[PDB]
Every structure is written in structure tokens, then in C-alpha cells.
Design a protein around this ligand. Structure first.
Ligand SMILES: O=C(O)c1ccc(Nc2ccnc(Nc3ccc(C(=O)O)cc3)n2)cc1
Length: 266
């Protein structure tokens, strides 16, 4: 923002999450007593794996975004053995944990999350910033329970052709991405459809036992609905999960979808 931070400026608290590259800790800035989240990345581990570039992007992109449904990146610093990301702290945790707790959400909570996410993505896209990694593990919850897009690790500017090695599951990736083709903002609209389905059903629509199998379901767009998913929900999800990118709706149409309108509270 202006000044340069150091570890000594923070009292680290309890672990929020422990991952492959780093951990996320609750932390408080000594002087102002400001409560935030500190993501500690080991570096050597970054240096291996050649991830140094993506991190500059993630930080560069996320630190320049200001939206109520987008977790903020206030700044960063490093030392000899690692890098620190100073993030806004989301008090209610991940959407993933909420989902794992309730099993599945009702139409109202889902419609509200989709809405908040569409606004968030609407803002990102107004900057040709495509997220490409929308999944429940990357969505946090604010003090009022509002959804916050949180992890811009795989974020890039559109249009892009980046053939990045897909390491996690392909569960949220669209056909154009799992096939190494060029892609734009429509990628996020597919993820949104996958997300809407996971929220209501409890499992992503293309889930399978092998990467290779999931790959097939995605490219062929083979998904079915359990009896309890309603017509309006099936409808929105079907418009979003279109193999042809140009056929997926605009976030505006999503926000104005009858089902998103009857059930959304936000
Ligand atoms: O997947 C993960 O485990 C994960 C992913 C991202 C992450 N990063 C941030 C950043 C800002 N704010 C928060 N809030 C938070 C609060 C409580 C809990 C909890 O479960 O007690 C988890 C998260 N987390 C932390 C953990």
C-alpha cells in the first residue's frame, strides 16, 4: 500500500488451513491490532515446481481487486526462506466445510451463493481477469455469511491459451480447458454451473473414480440430476453446462434467471 511489512509486525495465531505449499494462519498486526490472515509459502517449495511466476500473477491480480465478494490481498513480504501473503480474514471458513457439514444446501442458500459469486465474477470479468479455479475449497465466508472468492492461484487474463498442467481434479474445468484449447471468461460460467450443482446435490456433476473417466464425462458433458433437483435449478445448470462456450449465458442472464430470482435473498 505504501510501507513494507515484516514478520515481526505480526503475532501469528491458530492454523486456518494446512496445504502443500503453505499454511494459512490467523494473525494480528501488532500496532493497530488489526486481525487478518497470513498465508505462509515456503519458497524452496515454490522454487521447485517453478511456481514463482504464477505467484507474481496471483498477487498482482488479487491485490488490485476491490469487491465485497472477493477476498482482499493487502500486501506481501518475504524473508530468506519464504513468502507471506497478507489477506483479509474470512471468519466463517470455507464453503467446502459448510457443504461437508450440511451435505447439501437448499435452493435459497445456493441461489444466494450463486448470486454473490456471479457479482464477484462480473467484476473480475469487467477486467478480463478469469478465475478458472472456482471450487468450494476456494470460496470463503465473511462475518455475515457472504461468499468470498478467495484463491486466485490459477487466475489469468482473458483470452488465454495457457496449457497449464492440471494437477487437482478436473471436476470444475470446462471442455476447452481440459483439452488444452484457448479460453475466455466463459470458463467461469461453466464452473458456476458445476458449483450450483455441487451445492444442491452434494457432489460435483462429473464426479468419477479416475481422472481419465472424469475427463470423458466433462468432454461429453454427461451429467444427470437426482429427483430432488427442481426444474428451475436443472434449467439454470443446463444453460451453464454447455460444451460450446458461446452458448453459455452471460452473468447478467444468470443474475436475472427466474430460479435465481425466486430463491435468492441477496
Ligand atoms: O481449505 C482450507 O482448509 C483453507 C483455505 C483457505 C484459507 N485461507 C483463509 C484466508 C482467509 N480467511 C480464512 N478463513 C478461515 C477461517 C476459519 C477456518 C476454519 O476452518 O476454522 C478456515 C478459514 N481462510 C484457510 C484454509
Amino acid at each position: 500500500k505504501k510501507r513494507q511489512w515484516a514478520l515481526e509486525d505480526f503475532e501469528i495465531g491458530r492454523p486456518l488451513g494446512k496445504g502443500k505449499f503453505g499454511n494459512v494462519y490467523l494473525a494480528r498486526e501488532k500496532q493497530s491490532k488489526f486481525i487478518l490472515a497470513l498465508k505462509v509459502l515456503f519458497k524452496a517449495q515454490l522454487e521447485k515446481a517453478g511456481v514463482e511466476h504464477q505467484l507474481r500473477r496471483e498477487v498482482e491480480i488479487q491485490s488490485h481487486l476491490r469487491h465485497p465478494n472477493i477476498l482482499r490481498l493487502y500486501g506481501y513480504f518475504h524473508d530468506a526462506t519464504r513468502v507471506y501473503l497478507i489477506l483479509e480474514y474470512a471468519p466463517l471458513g470455507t464453503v467446502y466445510r459448510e457443504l461437508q457439514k450440511l451435505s447439501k444446501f437448499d435452493e435459497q442458500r445456493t441461489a444466494t451463493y450463486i448470486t454473490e459469486l456471479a457479482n464477484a465474477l462480473s467484476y473480475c470479468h469487467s477486467k478480463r481477469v478469469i478465475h478458472r479455479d472456482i471450487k468450494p475449497e476456494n470460496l470463503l465466508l465473511g462475518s455475515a455469511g457472504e461468499l468470498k472468492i478467495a484463491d486466485f492461484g490459477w487466475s489469468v487474463h482473458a483470452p488465454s491459451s495457457r496449457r497449464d498442467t492440471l494437477c487437482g481434479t478436473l471436476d470444475y474445468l470446462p471442455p476447452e480447458m481440459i483439452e488444452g484449447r484457448m479460453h475466455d471468461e466463459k470458463v467461469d460460467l461453466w464452473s458456476l454451473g458445476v458449483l450450483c450443482y455441487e451445492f444442491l446435490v452434494g457432489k460435483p456433476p462429473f464426479e468419477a473414480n479416475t481422472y481419465q473417466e472424469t475427463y470423458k464425462r466433462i468432454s461429453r458433458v454427461e451429467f444427470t440430476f437426482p429427483d430432488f433437483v427442481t426444474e428451475g435449478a436443472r434449467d439454470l445448470i443446463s444453460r451453464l453446462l454447455k460444451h460450446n462456450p458461446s452458448q453459455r449465458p452471460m452473468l447478467r442472464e444468470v443474475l436475472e434467471h427466474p430460479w435465481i430470482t425466486a430463491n435468492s435473498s441477496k
